[PDB]
Symmetry: D2
């Protein structure tokens, strides 16, 4: 009976407990210790709440679009009910899954409490919201505590007017004029969301683009998308402060530059939740930025102790958190282990249209660092695209020059988040464009355009 | 120079020409003799249009689902106008590609006119609608004439009340009571589409279900669905005839009972367009079903002569027709060749929800004929599904017992036609559930469930 | 810096160190504490020497086969001198590599001396033959102590007449009548070697054959061979004792009958060198057979503590010992890890001819447990074989029923130990008979038969 | 019943008939028509006779080598008996194989006799040595007639003193001083063979090396080998003439340069046997040099007619002849077809030691045309090498930089012809050095050095 105690039940923590319970039923004993809610911030506060929200926003799009398709009060509070609700329901499903796999699930905060630094088998005191405490022996420990919203002391949030992304679903009415500070992917997604609801938005970006995408082609597509929809924009701006004004907020840059609005949404980074964990008791020193630096097999510098997800700093994606957790267990439980390769991550930006990519960026290729052949197929010639009235979406594919091995791709379409999977497995399993061009994809489908992109790179 | 002449311009033909002219610009001369216009019936008549029609129908589905989301006349002629219009563009895009790729398109009906029956190089005649005629030499000949609606002489279509699916978009008003004769995928799809436009439907099915379907679990999802939305069906009945009554239509079936609707949609099958082609002049004799029996490498029993598409009877899907023309060009132009394997074909029924499958059916695994592990993962626990308010979708993945190689998969969800692709890649490339499980699919998406599906199959 | 201390320097150890120091020059400090000298018994005692001895024997085989080819004193002491001499060089080459790679080699016997039993970092003590002693800290510990000859107290080896295989090269003359006790691979090999030097041999086998062997067809090839060359055997008998007579030796077996030779070679098994290591100080308790039970990832039940080689009892082949040390370094240094699969191990018996096998035995396929296709291709039709005057060699390849993936192979020929490799690659990498069949092996060679073997399995 | 008639039964012809008969038993009818003897020149005159001969030569090597290994009249005619004999026996085995597979086997010369040029089904008149004739209908035709020794009109052979490689086995006594004209692989092999028998040899090379190997390393190994064994050498020499002298031969260069000897062995090229075939009757024009130019799928410019082996000019190796034939049938019979890639050919030079290589040459890599990592492992540190007293053999391996995919290798050892297979399948099936380093090769073996070469390239 090897004991596995996991601090945090978000995706790094939960998907880890799931691999441990499933693969080793009678050999192991898995204990998740989470303070805020199974599914973590991923499910109850950030990722699932933003996507649910964005998803809801869509409707207004397809409504203003029905008359030409032959078919002749937007109440914020209920949209929000759906958000808090679906989020809670996700969390409920996951809590169930864990329980039905023998996973012990405790509500409370965790902390290493090792009597001394060189112990092989560790100890974790779990303190409940119910005041009560409980200690647990652990052969394996996985620190999976996530991150919290970084906060600028010149822009301290309220929940009223200066808001972090978690406070949004607490607003009554749509804002009169939303000011998003911070460009970057999540700042972008909200600019697009609030834009679809009819809310005036002004972005305060660092560089030139409301969102600078490593793939130029797609980035330009969203830029046009934004101008054409009224997004206002401050290029090369750093919020010096965000004070509360008479009726709204006053955002002032470091240039002297200013912009007023009814609300300010702080879309800065996040910070690893890595304090008060006891890491000291076990000899661990947080690396730069306070992340718990981990290796390719998810392990910390102390023995038997693993770390995963946002608290480790690798990549702020729940998918990468899940795999790090999944990996830390395959390693500790003696199974095959394949380190996570940053270039096999599928990442998507949920704007309209979605941008998803996996593999070697086109820049890198256009710099001779990586030889490869490339193709960009415009989705307009595709009949499914046509039925979904897609106008500037395309599929890009990048393969090695000599072998035809798929090494990246970019997709800009309404469901790029799903169309990317196929290219990801190709990159992840050295599949050739020849092999890909061979798969009999469904007609009329957007994915048949993936199949031809590759068919065209054959050589 | 090798002379390629293709009879017929739908997926089989036009995309055999595409491969021909694209990979061998200077060693070939490709001529496509098609009578109805590039894209063939798949694009101009059957496939592209029904999917268009069904996509428009979709809007209604959503729309009145506005309240759950915080929000809150049907003009058939403009839907139809969009149906012809879009069809026309899909056809124009393809013609332009063939044309700029240097393919010689000849609008007309072509036929073989060989002197004796045993020659290497063939001779084809194109007859224009102008009565005019040109003759053409052919080193390689590709018969891609497709199929046509089957017709019951006791229920001859009439364009107004007795309708084939090609005729539906000629109506200027929704039927009062639609009677659909024939259970199958294409009757299933329209019953679903019309039920969504609010039309009453009565099916006269030959089988047990409106949509008989290989995978039981999918079948049920749809059976329960038509039944709730109130679709009426007479199981195991065939229409003895379809007469025209006062203002409606009288359907009479072989058992004597009768039903009455405003219109009757004949949804039987189709017939191969293989007559009057001069296949006699070259020694071929139409096989069972009047089909131009073909190879696994797309060739007929006569040398230099290939066929592909519905006119061969392999499978009536356009995706299969395209690979058949594609593989016939590959075999005739000395390139690498891989025969089509029926169990790699991915196929979807376009209902709401969609149903797609690939590889070994669960039927077989359960009979003991194939040694495999199987899993059925509901989609409702998936956050993305929760967002698209899916409660009955699911992912089924099947795999080899020992090796874990993916051999089949079934997907029932709103975009199954897209998500099936990754599975096909796995099937067509013997990818392993382990291999699939390491792919960092995106979160949150329904495709993440596909990687969990295989993750759990790991052994 | 992570401190690696390896107890024992044979394939398990020295080649765990090699991997250690070669891939992580600056993050590690590798110390190898070995008492007999780098290369261990595999190189200095058992493996390398018998193969050397057998290779010398080979010359005689050939030589008097001079007439068929147009052509046409045995000095045991110089053969033996070549046996020690070559052994010595193999050991010197390895020491030099370890040494220049910066590995700290310490000649001595090492043991665990941990204070309490539950620590992360361990402590080892090396005792020199000088009585001297040094102590060493160990983050990672690798127990690679190998095995020693089993000894029957009623037939204690004496160096002169009662011999273990380690002692054979101490004789200055060929035995008059060699009695070999114990049927097994290592008795089989020596019976063959001595029969070739012209020595009379009488085997007291516990089993049915001198060389009991998994694959029937191979077994026979050798049974017929020993029988023709006149090897004498008492089947199913165990030696009750081995006494020393006048000038020879009296072997008495449990049934009462007796045999008389000049010498007795005890060919029983060996015993794991797992005593006096201080495994108690760390919580381990020797498993069944006094073996240091290990993982599939080479780790013991104590953290930081790994084992590999004969002392674990996985498989007594040096090739298996080396992968065990190799995989223990990979798991401890956070690299990619793939557990050893027993059915990928390739193993050969060094008789004349050689016999090598890999993967599923034909035994199993024939029982119905594994669903496979099999073929046995004699080698005599192969031109190369005709040249090396082989009349009973053959190649057996086994493959998955549906997929055609290679899952086993057996090769009986003069260099089977080399030709088995390609098959192992196929087994270990799920290569397909189709995939193998396209490899342009060389003509003429016996390996061309391997590609035909799979070619015929194609389906 | 598709009819397949093959002109020539060497490896191109025979291995083709074997694939056709085996895969299509009741669908086909296979007819080989060969004039000289099944196995063709490959078996009855060139390749198998030279290897058998070389093999025989070895003995003298290992005899002069026995005294230090502890063991204290070379009649040419019998060595030759073995040669003619084994060659005839090979031929006998193959004739049997064909017969037992339903293949019809006719002795006689073949000729196309097509009534006219555009026939789909061809005709072949077979003329017997027995004067008699016979005609055969053919749906598929495979021209596989091999090549003949090119002959210099200034150096017309005798069979006495000026000899082609086929006349050698007709000599009574070993030559007094053999003069080989022509460097290149086969000229080399004979220099090595006659050298091992004690025969003085003088080579007349074009460039600087008795044999210029694309792999410098190995070439230098043979060069040293030759100087150290007495091979005399004329650098940059072209035989102007080879006249018969008083007692022997007088070879005079174009420089004015001369050298006398007892015999002259003409090792120039060979010429395709492509005359009198009727190729005219079917419209085929021989390409340059009179080769029957074929494509990647083994087909000629006439339909239904395939060509393979030496008569086509691709590569003068029986292995490449076999695959071309094997491929021409897979293509005609509608099976999967994979064109032959010149860079997946394993070629070996049978000298002592053998040189075998497959893949990208090291030159090409050392010219940045191909990025790759490389390694050269000297075989001296290997224990099996040591037992075979190998002194300058090594294993080279070349993998892509980014993926670790094996792309070539060179082996210089006593059985390089067999050790190369494993590297060939790796190159041919994109196997990674990681995968290769994972295969548990047999210890002590030469092939374990292949496994470490790759282990060392991991990254
Ligand atoms: C607005 C926004 C949108 C995003 N959208 C996406 C997206 O579309 N796709 C994607 O892949 N990623 C997305 N991300 C990123 C993704 O949310 C994170 O990568 C992922 O949440 C990190 O998961 P985790 O399991 O490491 O940590 P978390 O999910 O953040 O949770 C760790 C949990 O552990 C608990 N915890 C903390 N300290 C302790 C303690 N001492 N004891 C017990 N429990 C403790 C808490 O309850 C906490 O919820 C988004 C992020 C934001 C902010
Ligand atoms: C209602 C319906 C819905 C469908 N939905 C799907 C779907 O969702 N997905 C899918 O994959 N498949 C679908 N199919 C099937 C798919 O459309 C067919 O498999 C495909 O159309 C066949 O293509 P083809 O190129 O072989 O023939 P076709 O597309 O039928 O066209 C051959 C063309 O050649 C021409 N032609 C005929 N005779 C001659 C001649 N003598 N000379 C010159 N030209 C000639 C015609 O102009 C004709 O249009 C559907 C079918 C129907 C009936
Ligand atoms: C006659 C014979 C023939 C064989 N032929 C083959 C063959 O052809 N192929 C094959 O693959 N295998 C063969 N094997 C088996 C193979 O030799 C073993 O599998 C392999 O030797 C085991 O290697 P190891 O490194 O684990 O241990 P070893 O090679 O046995 O050595 C471990 C070493 O560690 C040392 N040691 C022991 N205790 C301590 C201690 N306390 N501190 C420090 N050092 C210690 C010793 O000096 C010893 O030499 C043969 C075996 C025998 C007996
Ligand atoms: C000295 C020497 C050594 C070699 N060593 C090797 C080696 O080690 N490895 C290797 O791979 N290659 C080697 N080769 C090359 C190899 O021999 C050739 O690649 C191979 O023989 C070609 O085979 P093929 O089947 O195309 O032709 P062939 O084997 O040459 O035979 C064609 C046959 O067809 C017959 N034929 C000709 N015309 C007609 C007709 N009209 N009708 C009927 N039959 C006809 C003849 O009987 C003839 O034998 C060597 C060559 C030489 C000269």
């Amino acid at each position: 009976v090897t004991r596995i105690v996991i601090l945090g039940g978000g995706p790094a923590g939960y998907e880890a407990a799931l691999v441990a319970a499933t693969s080793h039923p009678e050999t192991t004993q898995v204990t998740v210790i989470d303070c805020d809610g199974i599914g973590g911030a991923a499910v109850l506060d950030d990722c699932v709440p933003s996507k649910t929200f964005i998803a809801s926003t869509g409707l207004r799009t397809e409504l203003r679009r029905a008359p030409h398709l032959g078919f002749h009060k937007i109440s914020l509070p209920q949209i929000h009910a759906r958000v808090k609700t679906l989020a809670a329901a996700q969390s409920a499903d996951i809590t169930a899954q864990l329980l039905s796999m023998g996973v012990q699930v405790i509500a409370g905060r965790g902390e290493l409490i090792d009597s001394t630094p060189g112990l092989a088998r560790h100890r974790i005191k779990a303190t409940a919201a119910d005041g009560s405490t409980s200690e647990h022996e652990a052969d394996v420990v996985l620190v999976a505590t996530g991150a919290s919203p970084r906060i600028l002391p010149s822009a301290q949030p309220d929940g009223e007017r200066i808001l972090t992304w978690r406070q949004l679903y607490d607003l009554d009415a749509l804002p009169d004029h939303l000011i998003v500070v911070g460009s970057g992917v999540t700042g972008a997604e909200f600019v697009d969301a609030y834009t679809e609801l009819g809310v005036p938005v002004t972005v305060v970006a660092s560089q030139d683009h409301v969102l600078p995408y490593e793939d130029a082609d797609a980035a330009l597509v969203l830029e046009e998308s934004f101008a054409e929809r009224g997004v206002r924009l401050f290029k090369n701006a750093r919020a010096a402060s965000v004070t509360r004004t008479g009726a709204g907020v006053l955002v002032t840059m470091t240039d002297g530059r200013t912009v007023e609005g009814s609300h300010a949404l702080m879309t800065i980074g996040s910070v690893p939740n890595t304090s008060g964990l006891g890491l000291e008791r076990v000899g661990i020193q947080l690396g730069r930025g306070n992340y718990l630096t981990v290796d390719r097999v998810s392990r910390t510098l102390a023995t038997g102790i693993y770390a995963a997800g946002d608290c480790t700093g690798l990549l702020p994606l729940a998918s990468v958190a899940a795999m790090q957790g999944r990996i830390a267990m395959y390693h500790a439980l003696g199974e095959g282990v394949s380190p996570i390769r940053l270039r096999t991550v599928a990442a998507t930006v949920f704007t309209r249209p979605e941008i998803a990519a996996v593999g070697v960026p086109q820049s890198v290729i256009d710099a001779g660092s990586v030889a490869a052949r490339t193709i960009m197929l415009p989705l307009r010639t595709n009949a499914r695209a046509k039925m979904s009235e897609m106008r500037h979406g395309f599929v890009k594919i990048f393969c090695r020059r000599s072998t035809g091995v798929v090494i990246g791709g970019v997709v800009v379409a309404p469901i790029a988040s799903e169309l990317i999977l196929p290219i990801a497995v190709a990159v992840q399993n050295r599949i050739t464009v020849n092999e890909l061009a061979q798969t009999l994809a469904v007609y009329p489908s957007l994915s048949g355009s993936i199949t031809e992109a590759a068919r065209r790179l054959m050589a």
